[PDB]
Each structure stands twice: as C-alpha cells, then as structure tokens.
Design an enzyme around this catalytic site. Sequence first.
Site, mmCIF file in Angstrom:
data_model
loop_
_atom_site.group_PDB
_atom_site.id
_atom_site.type_symbol
_atom_site.label_atom_id
_atom_site.label_comp_id
_atom_site.label_asym_id
_atom_site.label_seq_id
_atom_site.Cartn_x
_atom_site.Cartn_y
_atom_site.Cartn_z
ATOM 1 C CB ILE A 146 -1.173 -0.250 0.726
ATOM 2 C CG1 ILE A 146 -1.676 -1.253 1.016
ATOM 3 C CG2 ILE A 146 -1.767 1.495 1.345
ATOM 4 C CD1 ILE A 146 -2.277 -1.265 -0.065
ATOM 5 N N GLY A 147 1.854 1.595 0.555
ATOM 6 C CA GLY A 147 3.143 2.281 0.829
ATOM 7 C C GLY A 147 3.608 2.323 2.094
ATOM 8 C CB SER A 148 7.413 2.877 2.060
ATOM 9 O OG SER A 148 7.392 2.333 1.253
ATOM 10 N N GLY A 149 6.003 4.206 4.661
ATOM 11 C CA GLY A 149 5.590 6.259 6.280
ATOM 12 C C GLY A 149 7.265 5.717 6.471
ATOM 13 C CB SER A 150 7.571 8.253 9.325
ATOM 14 O OG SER A 150 7.531 7.958 10.696
ATOM 15 C CG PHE A 151 7.566 3.850 12.072
ATOM 16 C CD1 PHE A 151 6.219 5.238 12.053
ATOM 17 C CD2 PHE A 151 6.905 2.472 12.673
ATOM 18 C CE1 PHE A 151 4.933 5.019 11.771
ATOM 19 C CE2 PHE A 151 5.391 2.577 13.337
ATOM 20 C CZ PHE A 151 4.709 3.505 12.591
ATOM 21 N N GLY A 152 7.583 2.215 8.624
ATOM 22 C CA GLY A 152 7.118 1.028 8.082
ATOM 23 C C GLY A 152 6.768 1.492 6.242
ATOM 24 C CG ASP B 208 5.937 10.321 14.528
ATOM 25 O OD1 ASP B 208 6.136 9.619 13.326
ATOM 26 O OD2 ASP B 208 6.885 9.661 15.121
#
Lengths: 310, 274
Positions: B15-21, B128
């Site tokens: 789905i997508g890459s965040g600030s820590f996963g 966050d």
Amino acid sequence: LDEQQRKRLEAFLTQKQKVGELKDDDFEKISELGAGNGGVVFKVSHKPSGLVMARKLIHLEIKPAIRNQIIRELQVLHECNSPYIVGFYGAFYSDGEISICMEHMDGGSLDQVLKKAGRIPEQILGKVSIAVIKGLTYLREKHKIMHRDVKPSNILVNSRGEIKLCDFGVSGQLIDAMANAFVGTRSYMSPERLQGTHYSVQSDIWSMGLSLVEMAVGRYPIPPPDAKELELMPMAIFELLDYIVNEPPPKLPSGVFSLEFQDFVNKCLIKNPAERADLKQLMVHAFIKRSDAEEVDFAGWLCSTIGLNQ
Amino acid sequence: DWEIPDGQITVGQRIGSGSFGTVYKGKWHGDVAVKMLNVTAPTPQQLQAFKNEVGVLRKTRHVNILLFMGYSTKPQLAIVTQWCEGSSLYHHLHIIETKFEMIKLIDIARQTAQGMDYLHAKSIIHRDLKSNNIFLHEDLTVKIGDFGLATVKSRWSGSHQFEQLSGSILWMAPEVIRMQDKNPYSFQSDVYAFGIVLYELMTGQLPYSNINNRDQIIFMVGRGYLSPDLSKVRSNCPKAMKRLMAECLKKKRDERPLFPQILASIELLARSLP
Ligand SMILES: Nc1ncnc2c1ncn2[C@@H]1O[C@H](COP(=O)(O)OP(=O)(O)NP(=O)(O)O)[C@@H](O)[C@H]1O
Ligand SMILES: Nc1ncnc2c1ncn2[C@@H]1O[C@H](COP(=O)(O)OP(=O)(O)NP(=O)(O)O)[C@@H](O)[C@H]1O
Ligand SMILES: O=C(c1ccc(F)c(F)c1Nc1ccc(I)cc1F)N1CC(O)([C@@H]2CCCCN2)C1
Ligand SMILES: [Mg+2]
Ligand SMILES: [Mg+2]
C-alpha cells in the site's frame, strides 16, 4: 564539442526514434539498481524497441492536478541533449507511480563508486569536476535550469568513461513532493539556500565543492575529521544544517592534495554566495587547466574499481 | 505474550512506505493493516521494550483511536492494526480536496482532540501526529493511528537508540526538529502537531506552501525563524478558532495548552455556532 561526442549524441537520438509511447507492459524488469530516498530504480528492457534503460519509479501521493503538471514539465528533458547529461527516453504516470526513463549508466553513481573505492584520486576528481562544470553550464545557458542538488549520487558514469549529470531540478513540484516524503541524513544545501536565499548556479557550485571533498577523503565532511581519523588515510540533521550556516566550511587536508586542488575546493566552499566562484572562473582555474591537460584513463580506473575488465 | 503465529496473517496488497514502516493490506479475521517495520534489527533490549510498548498500546481502546490488533515477529518484525475503510485526512484535504462543510471541519478537529486527549490521559505521547495518521472511517468518525512505538521509530545499537527525524517534518514542533533536548517528544510536541493539523483544516493547505526546500524548513523552524503563515486561514474560520490554533503553535513548548483545555475550547466553539 568533439567528434567522438557527436557520435554518441546522435547514436542516442537514433536509439530514441525506436521508442514510442512508454507503456508499463512494454517493459521487462532485469535487475534492481537500488532505491534512493525518493524513488527506486530498475534496469529494464523496453520490449518494443529492445533497448535497455533505467526506470526510476516515484510513488507519490499528490493531487492529480499537480501530478499532471510534473509530467508536463518532465517532458522538457526531451530537449536536454548534452554529453554531460544522462539521456532521457520519456516520462509517464502509471499505477500510482511516476516513471522516468533514462539511459543505463553501467558504472553507477559516483556514490556507488566511492563506496567501491574508499576515496577517489585527484587526477580523477579533476576530470569529474570538468564534467560537472560543463553539465551545470549546459543547464544554465541553454535551459536556465538550476540543478538544485548536486551530490555524488546524482553524477553517473559509465564504462565508456562518460561523466553525466542526472536527477536535476526540471520540475520544482517534483522536488518538493519528494522531500516531504523522506528526509535524509546528509545535506548538500549551500548555507544561503538553507537561509532562504537562492543564487542561481552559485548554490550548485557549493554542492559540487562539498561533493568533491567527500569523494576526495571518502567521508561526508561535516563535521571535519576528528584530527585522528584524518591521519587514517552520527549527527542530527538539524545540527548539520546549523553547522553549515554557523561554522567555517570544510577544507581538504594539507600536503596530501595539490595546492591547486585545495584551492579549487576552497573557492567552491565560500559561505558568501557572491565571494564563492562562478562557472566562468572555475572553468579557467589552475586545477582545471591542469586536470584537463592530464591524460587519465578514466574508463579503466572505473572498471578496475567496480571489479570488471577495461 | 501478544504475538500472532506466523501463518496467521494473509499479507496482501502493498500500500505504501511511511516514516517507519511499509504497510500491506492483510487478512486476519477480517481485513487488517500490516506494517512491516524498518527496524529489522531485533535487538535483545529492543524486542523486550517493543514487547512492553505493545502491551500498553494493546489495551488502548477509544472510538477515535485506531485499534492495535497486535504484532508478529515471524517472518520479521511487523504490526497489525485495524484496516481503515476510507481515506486519510491528508488524502481528503490535499488529494481529493473534499469540500467539507465549515461545521464538519470543526467536528473533525473536535473528534481529534477527543482522541488525542485519551492518549495523554493514558500517558501516551503520539510523537507522529499528522493528517496522514487520521482516517475518516465511513467519512463520519475520526480514527487516529500510528501512535507510540518510540522503540521502533528509532534504530538501535545495543541498549541505546538514536532518535532520527524521519518522514515528514511539517508537523514537528521546533524542539523535535532540533533534537537538542533530553526527550524532546512531549505532550506539547503532540499539541504542536495538532496545531499544524488545524492549519490544514483552516487553510486547506499544508504549511510553508511557498518554500520548495526541505532542509530550509528544518533549519528555520528549529532556529525559530519560521512558523506557518496564518493569514492563509480561510475567510470564514471562527475568530475563536484561529486563536486556538496559534496557542498550539507557540514556539516555546511550555506556552502550548494541554488537550483537556484544547478539547474544551472546541466544544465551546462548536456549540456557539449558527
Ligand atoms: N540511470 C541510472 N543508471 C544507473 N544507476 C542509477 C540510475 N539512476 C539512479 N541510479 C542508482 O540507483 C539507486 C537508486 O536511485 P536514486 O533514487 O536516483 O538514488 P538516490 O539519488 O540516492 N535517491 P535521491 O536522494 O532521492 O536522489 C542509486 O544507487 C543510484 O546511484
Ligand atoms: N490502518 C490503515 N488502514 C488502511 N490504510 C492505511 C492504514 N495505515 C496506513 N495506511 C495507508 O498506508 C500508506 C502509508 O502508510 P504509513 O506507514 O502510515 O505512512 P504515513 O502514514 O504516510 N507516514 P507515518 O504514518 O507518520 O509513518 C498510506 O497510503 C496510508 O493511507
Ligand atoms: O528524482 C529526482 C528528480 C526531482 C525533480 C525532477 F525534475 C527530476 F526530473 C528528478 N529526476 C530526474 C531528472 C533528470 C533525469 I536525465 C533523470 C531523473 F530521474 N530527484 C531530485 C533528487 O535527486 C533529490 C530528491 C529530493 C531532494 C532533492 N533532490 C531525486
Ligand atoms: Mg539520484
Ligand atoms: Mg498513517
């Protein structure tokens, strides 16, 4: 320009005629070339034309109006055609990802190469700096384009000894949209640009100089080596940026680098964007007059350093 | 032991890459959100501190808080939270440009202080809070996810973890930018975040819209030289509202209100509203 360069520049143009609409199903993944902190890149084969390119994939979350402008503005790269600028095959949006298609440079970025090489030699850095100066000029004169982020992983190099610029700021939106996404740990941002002032190629030149010194010693030079690690021959991002602004610039180590080269970088790294040298000056500096004169086997040095043949 | 067996989660679409996963939509007694942590260095001190932190997050239950359905260590370190039907605030404000009514905007902010208060009441710092971590479940209710997890929002070298700025900075209070304090993350670093979220709601824009330089923002916000341009507040935003936003955005963290008082201001502003 040159006879051998005009061969290469037309050879691309002709390989580019066999390319039409870039459809995502027109591609076969070969190998991953690595990710960055904006996109991830693949060596790929364009089924229709048979060519081999690099496909940078930027997964962004932006409103479609903006995306459609970024794509419009990346079509300006069909007009960048210098032997110092990576070739461009097209750009498009599919499946949530902007694709930028460009020529494969089999040597990689100077960053990839610097890791494979520890530190880089001055005779080499000389011929690199010539290339960057020429690429930065070609972008300022013929396009009025500021690179916006000169760094070793944005200089590419290949086994025919070519040195070429890439990832340069031809769409401001796209830079902006990629930066809120993944803040890094390093910074090539000149100290004016960190304080809101922008200075045409003056702020790029600073990035170059910094990059020269990083490649030259083998480590990102902020802060400078702790006296002892210098003789060997973690920091918070807000602090690097505070240092860049509120501390003297980095300098090469004495004695082990030519007087002409320690000077060339030091003029590059002046904190006042106006005292800092411009392209006209760097181009006729001692260190460039000489390193242009030096005959150096660049492709052999590269292929030796990566672990390949000639 | 709050772990799930390996072959319990049917990991599905990326789905997508965040600030820590990186988040994959999952299956596990109904849809889930599987976030594969970027810390794949399961240190002995880490795995016991993240185990402890999952303990606290597991027993956080509130209507405006995303359900923390537990975690996984096999294959690698992962996290299973409730899958949200429906887009995040950020997608609504900035991608689809959903044309919310003035009252509904307030109520998004009310429901958010609503939840954030529960966190602080259960002594949880979010660290966050951003509009990407506020989903609008069935477009009605607000759900705040991605809270806590300090032990895995940093990477470890033994029993010491270096706290790195990651992801987007627009919501980071200036003391969090600088990282020069002891723990700079605080109930006001969360409140300051909330302040930026209010800016999104009141203006329809992210802050620093006129600065296409990231590092510039970092330096200047940290050094105090930069703060959001508040004239950009849409014409018909309550005078009482604009003021509340500026309290949260106070540069010195100790002038910022706490959520008990913040939530109060909004409901007062909600009631008295034509
Ligand atoms: N055209 C290309 N040919 C070969 N390698 C490439 C090419 N473009 C990028 N790369 C490499 O592929 C990897 C990922 O690409 P890229 O996203 O351009 O890296 P990056 O510069 O570190 N990220 P960023 O900070 O956003 O610019 C890096 O190791 C690059 O050196
Ligand atoms: N519980 C969830 N249900 C559905 N989609 C989700 C969920 N959590 C995250 N997402 C989506 O997953 C993608 C990225 O996830 P995420 O790792 O949280 O990045 P981020 O939220 O933008 N930054 P951050 O949350 O601060 O690390 C986005 O498209 C989100 O909308
Ligand atoms: O990927 C890019 C990039 C940004 C803006 C832009 F217009 C581009 F065209 C970019 N890519 C690009 C440009 C020319 C060629 I030939 C090939 C390309 F892939 N960037 C800028 C970047 O290096 C970093 C990321 C954000 C921080 C500053 N720049 C990554
Ligand atoms: Mg690059
Ligand atoms: Mg989220």
